[PDB]
């Protein structure tokens, strides 16, 4: 299992940004996928979840980002995508890409700053 985040950059409020997570080492269609950010002065905050194929790939977001963030997946290349719009209001963090929320957050990535 290997999780590699990417796409972090410098975008001040008003714009948008799409972060990518390159998964490898497991069946990408049979596992959940979570984005969980970490602000500098905030311990940790779960951001978004995208369910497996058995759930018809439905998504869910936290109340802090519900309506502005969109999580999706490329089932052909096994890549997580997180499109954030109207960001950087207070969303400057080190967003991480993890596998399982309900079974304990395991096999984290490295995080990208934005």
């Amino acid at each position: 299992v290997k999780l590699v985040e990417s796409g972090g950059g410098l975008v001040q409020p008003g714009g948008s940004l799409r972060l990518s997570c390159a998964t490898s080492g497991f069946t990408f269609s049979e596992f959940f996928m979570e984005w969980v950010r970490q602000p500098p002065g905030k311990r940790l905050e779960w951001v978004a979840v995208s369910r497996n194929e058995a759930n018809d790939y439905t998504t869910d977001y936290s109340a802090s980002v519900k309506g502005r963030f969109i999580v999706s997946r490329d089932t052909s290349q096994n890549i997580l995508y997180l499109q954030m719009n109207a960001l950087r209001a207070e969303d400057t963090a080190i967003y991480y890409c993890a596998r399982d929320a309900w079974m304990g957050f395991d096999y984290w990535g490295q995080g990208t700053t934005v």
Partner: peptide, 24 residues
């Protein structure tokens, strides 16, 4: 249903303990 996670200074996060008693 508790998990203990370790985040190294470089930024890598690794789950140390799941189910509050079991080890990865």
């Amino acid at each position: 249903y508790l998990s203990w996670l370790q985040q190294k200074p470089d930024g890598t996060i690794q789950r140390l303990i799941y189910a509050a008693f079991s080890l990865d």
